[PDB]
Amino acid sequence: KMVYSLVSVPEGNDISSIFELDPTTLRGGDSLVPRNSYVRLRHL
Amino acid sequence: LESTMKLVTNLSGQLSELKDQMTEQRKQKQRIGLLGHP
Amino acid sequence: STEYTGPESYVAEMIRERNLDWFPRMRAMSLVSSDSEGEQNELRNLQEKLESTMKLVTNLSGQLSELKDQMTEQRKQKQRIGLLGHP
Ligand SMILES: [Ca+2]
Numbered sequence A: 001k002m003v004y005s006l007v008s009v010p011e012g013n014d015i016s017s018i019f020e021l022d023p024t025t026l027r028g029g030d031s032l033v034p035r036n037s038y039v040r041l042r043h044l
Numbered sequence B: 001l002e003s004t005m006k007l008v009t010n011l012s013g014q015l016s017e018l019k020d021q022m023t024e025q026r027k028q029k030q031r032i033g034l035l036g037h038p
Numbered sequence C: 001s002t003e004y005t006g007p008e009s010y011v012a013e014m015i016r017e018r019n020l021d022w023f024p025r026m027r028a029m030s031l032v033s034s035d036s037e038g039e040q041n042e043l044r045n046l047q048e049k050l051e052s053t054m055k056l057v058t059n060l061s062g063q064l065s066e067l068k069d070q071m072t073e074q075r076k077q078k079q080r081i082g083l084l085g086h087p
Helices: B002-035 C006-016 C038-084
Strands: A019-023 A039-043
Antiparallel strands (some): A019 A039
């Protein structure tokens, strides 16, 4: 199912607006994010 | 023998950096356990 | 001139130019029995650049060790202030 859907909220100090970034290849966690790399968005 | 130093110094460096990456992943795990579970 | 090779063309244009610099003067390839002596220079450059690589790797090893030690020291500081500060 679709438990949650993306919306736009006016305040940005909440915890519901924060996201986690997931790479598409084998990239180290401490490495810098390349400028134009494909990624996956995970809601923290 | 300086090539042997190449080998031994390289192994020392990789062991040190893997130790550091376990340290960094421990820090990452504790930070996500603290921030993620307030 | 149709089927001159490399050296033949060189010599032909030298003798047309009225030049005699293509003769070997006080030189002979048999006398210079020294083979490629650039191997020693390559070895010296190899050892120098590779000791610079040891500079880099040894420096990174030292900084990693000292940062490990400074986490150890701050852990000791934190435990000492948690023990003395909370008796
Ligand atoms: Ca020809």
